[PDB]
Design a protein around this nucleic acid. Structure first.
Lengths: 75, 107, 842, 44
RNA sequence: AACGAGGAAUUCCUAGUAAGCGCAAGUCAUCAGCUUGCGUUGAUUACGUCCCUGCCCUUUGUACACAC
């Protein structure tokens, strides 16, 4: 933009969609068991169940909602 | 040509000038006409001047004229090349006929 | 490290210039170099001058020789003066505030003619390189440029808003139409070089290069060559050398003058039809006392015209101008080459000059050296001396910038002054020393036969008691003042010519050049041959030695100042300077710093300890001949062959995408105008044609075709792959439109056809999936028209191929020799067929 | 028949089969064609 | 008493690669405040484009068809 940067929306290709999917899930469970009594198995099970519900109490679904909102804003 | 794109070939008075040209000027005109026949962007102009000549001179004279069947001999093969390419273009142009068939059949 | 700036310029009364005369004798404009000057004729007193503010020498100034002011002509109705300088720059001055109001720079070479009508404020200029510019003063921009000549411009006559008639330095005359804005007619005028052009409403008079003036009749008739210019006659016999300027004038018998390049100028009268009929009858009675009418048609030119008279004026003239009164006086202002401006008058009663000779009034030669200055001298910071080979020893006061006394002494060479008695001494190219007084007459004791050759250099000791005169007799002579006569006392007879002499300010050394590239340095007190300095490869021209006898500066013809230390006789420092040649060099009177003036119009100021040109001075444009430095003040007076005296005082897009944008604009204009056509047809307001189409003046098909043409063939497949389907529909409509315009179609048939077939093969699935009766109708039109075009072109090709084969076959079976035996004719054929060589790898 | 340089002198003939007399060129174009032949025969 | 994985900036990186983990030698220069070898577990992300910062290149088809 010559100095005036701006976010434009683009569509995304399924190998990128699957790579985001896997990264989002595992980063969510690692940082949810960063320092707790929980461990990777239990937090990751928590996350996979919730995300498969889609129930939006979960890391990856929150970040997905964020990214379609940002596209929805400035397409 | 461009003005005469609307039995004449060019404007008629111009045709009369070409008809009453001299022999020496016919040689010089066909020298320049062969030169423009070389490339394929001025071939139309070359072909039209040639056709105007052939239709408005005595052909036995034109064969007779000294040092000209050399030039004529260099003129044929490039015109066969052009003939073949333009005929190829008619050939590709039957696509539109195909597409019309397909569209009416959909319709 | 002070810096010097120019303060003055004398003797520059009129040179290299074309004068413009103002009636009130009234005042007159000439130009100095780089500068204008105006004055009253009868008093001869300067009024004003115009130049840029910063002088050459302020360190802001640029390192280049300044532009000479080469033409000027005025407009009294608006009272402006348009001058043109030989860098081809046009400056217009106000004459009341004497300030510039605007400038112009369109040419490249020097400007010859300005000619301008303030009526609409049209300015017309013709320079040394062949184009004519026309301008408007009110808009101060470039209107336009007329260019078809080849060598230069020497004359042109405007007429109204319609025509120019111009002549070049290669001898052809060209008439230009200003509407269609271009050449119409051309005629070669004379064999060599035509120079002058002057127009009366009937007839046009031009000059050749060898005293043949030619006479045309001019009209406004509208044949091709006919009607316009016709070739009435040839008059001649002015001089032998060619003329330059012709001007008409009237009261009503009219007159015109030819100004030549020689000493002379000519004036003619042009008669009236009554005298024409009278001479016709007289000549016809001589005819009777047919082909004889052809003879009188041949003597036409001398029949109509008439040699009024001449002026065998003096030496040489630059410019001239008319003045008429009473039908009994014609007057010429006359700017010479040498520094004179003269008035000339002639009586007449519309019949005859009534005078044995033209009369010379009001010369102006007073403050102008009138020849070439050969030397300068400064005297006691108050007094200035200028000598020139007319002898015209002009004595000047600086602070008045003006002359005091003038003498004459023949071809003077070198000047010097005597503070004692305030008496000046000169020497010539003949061996005669001439010593002059200032209050009284010049000649006091004019010595002759002092030297059998030209003398060259001359100096006096720090007291003013003796004179050393070195002269091309290969001798130097030493002379003493007796009381006030001069007596030679002794002579040193060397081997070669003397080119300069100087003595120390402490009076101990004598420096004498030779014709060999050598200089000798003698002890003054007893003539002892103390040293010999060697090595300039070309002779020394000018010598200095220091203010205190420490160093010696020698400057020679091979462009290298040498600085010698005087004690042991060593060369300190060599210095290549001054691309032509050095004429002289001078010290500051206090310190080891020194000025140097060349033959190529630069004055270079040096430091004598870093040995660098501190400053370069770019005042003027001739061979600088001499220089002298104030005894204290640091102002320096430089004098040069341009008869001039200067004083320095001390102080974007991707292809394919641009196709889409063109496609949008084109389809928009097309469909809008179509809808408006539908509107008027239903009736029985123009939708506005867009800026790009209007501004380039291109119809929409030509626009889109031009973007398609500019795209390159490596990017054409990718581009048509890039556009979306909607733009493909637009593309199909565009192809329909060019089929409407057949001439464009047959012009660019391969481009169109290739693009069409590619874009359809690529978008085929969409294309058949679209159902639109518009699209079916469009495809029928496009397909039928493409077949018509390709088919008729092909039919030409077939006819030509058959015909040329028939021609060759006929000539074969009549000329080329035929055999019967098959092997024998096969031998013949493999002889005579075309053979082409080819480089095979084996 | 290739096309090569014209056997008069008054013409300049290019490689795409277009020939131009020396007279009927404007002076700038005579310049630019001299430039083109300059660099071409400067290599070869 | 200092510390809970290290700021702004810059550098480096595309498969047995990044990163972990130990064992062994010490080789005419270098190396023990260490240097080179040797195995063992072993990935995430690009693998496209000249749009950006650069970096080169050619602007004479020339070599021989055909095409362009």
């Amino acid at each position: 933009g010559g100095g005036a940067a701006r976010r434009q929306a683009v569509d995304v290709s399924p190998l990128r969609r699957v790579n985001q999917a896997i990264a989002l899930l595992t980063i969510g469970a690692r940082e949810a068991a960063f320092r707790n009594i929980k461990t990777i198995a239990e937090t990751l099970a928590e996350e996979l169940i919730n995300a498969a519900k889609g129930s939006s109490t979960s890391y990856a679904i929150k970040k997905k909602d964020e990214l379609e909102r940002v596209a929805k804003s400035n397409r | 040509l461009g003005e005469s794109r609307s039995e004449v070939i060019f404007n008629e008075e111009l045709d009369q000038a070409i008809s009453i040209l001299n022999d020496e000027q016919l040689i010089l005109l066909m020298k320049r006409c062969r030169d423009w026949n070389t490339n394929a962007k001025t071939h139309t102009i070359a072909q039209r001047t040639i056709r105007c000549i052939l239709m408005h001179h005595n052909i036995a004279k034109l064969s007779e004229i000294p040092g000209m069947v050399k030039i004529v001999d260099a003129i044929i093969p490039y015109t066969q090349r052009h003939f073949t390419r333009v005929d190829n273009l008619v050939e590709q142009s039957y696509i539109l006929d195909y597409a019309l068939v397909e569209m009416d059949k959909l319709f | 490290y002070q810096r010097f700036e120019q303060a003055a310029a004398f003797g520059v009364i009129a040179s290299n210039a074309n004068c413009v005369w103002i009636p009130a004798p009234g005042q007159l404009i000439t130009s100095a170099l780089e500068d204008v000057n105006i004055w009253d004729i009868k008093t001869g007193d300067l009024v004003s001058k115009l130049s840029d503010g910063l002088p050459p020498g302020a360190s802001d100034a640029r390192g280049a020789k300044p532009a000479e002011c080469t033409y000027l002509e005025a407009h009294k109705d608006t009272d402006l003066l348009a001058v043109g300088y030989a860098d081809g720059v046009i400056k217009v001055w106000d004459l009341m505030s004497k300030t510039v109001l605007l400038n112009f720079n369109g040419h490249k070479a020097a400007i010859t003619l300005l000619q301008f009508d303030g009526t609409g404020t049209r300015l017309i200029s013709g320079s040394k390189d062949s184009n004519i510019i026309v301008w408007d003063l009110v808009g101060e921009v470039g209107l336009y440029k007329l260019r078809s000549h080849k060598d230069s411009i020497t004359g042109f006559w405007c007429q109204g808003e319609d025509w120019l008639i111009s002549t070049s330095k290669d001898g052809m005359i060209k008439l230009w139409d200003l509407k269609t804005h271009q050449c119409i007619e051309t005629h070669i005028a004379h064999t060599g070089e035509c120079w002058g052009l002057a127009v009366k409403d009937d007839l046009l008079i031009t000059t050749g290069t060898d005293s043949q003036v030619k006479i045309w009749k001019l009209d406004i008739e509208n044949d091709k060559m006919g009607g316009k210019l016709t070739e009435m006659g040839i008059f001649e016999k002015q001089s032998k050398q060619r003329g330059l300027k012709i001007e008409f004038i009237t009261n009503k018998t009219s007159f015109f003058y030819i100004q030549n390049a020689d000493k002379t100028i000519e004036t003619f009268r042009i008669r009236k039809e009554e005298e024409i009929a009278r001479g016709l009858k007289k000549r016809e009675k001589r005819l009777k006392e047919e082909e004889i009418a052809k003879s009188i048609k041949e003597s036409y030119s001398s029949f109509i015209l008439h040699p009024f008279q001449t002026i065998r004026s003096l030496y040489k003239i630059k410019s001239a101008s008319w003045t008429t009164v009473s039908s009994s006086k014609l007057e010429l202002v006359l700017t010479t080459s040498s520094n004179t401006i003269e008035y000339y008058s002639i009586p007449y009663e519309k019949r005859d000059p009534t005078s044995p000779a033209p009369l010379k009034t009001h010369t102006i030669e007073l403050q102008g050296q009138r020849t070439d200055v050969r030397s300068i001298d400064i005297s006691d910071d108050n007094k200035l001396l200028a000598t020139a080979s007319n002898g015209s020893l002009k004595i000047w006061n600086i602070k008045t910038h003006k002359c005091i006394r003038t003498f004459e002494c023949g071809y003077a060479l070198t000047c010097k002054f005597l503070p004692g008695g305030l008496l000046v001494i000169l020497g010539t190219r003949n061996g005669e020393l001439q010593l002059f007084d200032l209050a009284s007459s010049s000649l006091l004791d004019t010595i002759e036969d002092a030297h059998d050759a030209a003398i060259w250099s001359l100096d006096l000791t720090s007291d003013g008691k003796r004179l050393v005169t070195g002269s091309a007799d290969k001798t130097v002579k030493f002379w003493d003042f007796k009381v006030l006569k001069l007596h030679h006392d002794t002579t040193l007879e060397l081997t070669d010519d003397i080119l300069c002499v100087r003595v120390s300010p402490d009076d101990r050394y004598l420096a004498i050049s030779l014709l060999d590239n050598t200089v000798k340095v003698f002890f003054l007190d007893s003539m002892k041959f103390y040293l010999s300095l060697y090595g300039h490869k070309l002779p020394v021209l000018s010598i200095d030695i220091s203010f205190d006898s420490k160093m010696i500066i020698t400057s020679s013809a091979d462009k290298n100042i040498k600085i010698w230390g005087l004690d042991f006789g060593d060369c300190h420092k060599s210095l290549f300077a001054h691309q032509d040649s050095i004429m002289n060099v001078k010290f500051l009177p206090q310190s080891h710093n020194f000025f140097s003036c060349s033959k190529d119009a630069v004055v270079k100021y040096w430091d004598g300890e870093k040995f660098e040109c501190i400053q370069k001075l770019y005042a003027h444009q001739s061979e600088v001949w001499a220089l002298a430095v104030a005894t204290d003040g640091g102002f320096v007076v430089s004098s040069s062959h341009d008869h001039s005296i200067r004083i320095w005082e001390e102080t974007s897009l991707k292809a394919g995408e641009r196709l889409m944008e063109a496609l949008d604009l084109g389809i928009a204009e097309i469909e809008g105008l179509e809808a408006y056509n539908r509107d008027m047809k239903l009736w029985q307001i123009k939708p506005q044609g867009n800026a790009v189409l209007i501004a380039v003046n291109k119809t929409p098909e030509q626009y889109i075709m031009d973007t398609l043409l500019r795209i390159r063939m490596s990017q054409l497949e990718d581009a048509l792959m890039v556009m979306p389907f909607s733009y493909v529909l637009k593309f199909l409509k565009f192809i329909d439109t060019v089929m409407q315009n057949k001439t464009l179609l047959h012009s660019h048939l391969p481009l169109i056809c290739k693009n069409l077939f590619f874009i359809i093969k690529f978008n085929h699935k969409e294309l058949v999936s679209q159902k639109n009766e518009e699209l079916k109708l469009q495809i029928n039109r496009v397909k039928t028209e493409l077949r018509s075009a390709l088919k008729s072109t092909e039919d030409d090709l077939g006819f030509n191929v058959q015909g040329l084969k028939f021609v060759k076959q006929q000539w074969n079976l009549r000329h080329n020799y035929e055999f019967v035996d098959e092997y024998d004719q096969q031998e013949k054929e493999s002889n005579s067929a075309r053979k082409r060589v080819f480089g095979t790898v084996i | 028949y290739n096309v090569g340089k014209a056997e008069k002198d008054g013409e300049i003939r290019l490689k795409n089969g277009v020939a131009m007399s020396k007279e009927e060129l404007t002076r700038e174009d005579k310049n630019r064609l001299r430039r083109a032949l300059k660099r071409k025969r400067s290599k070869a």
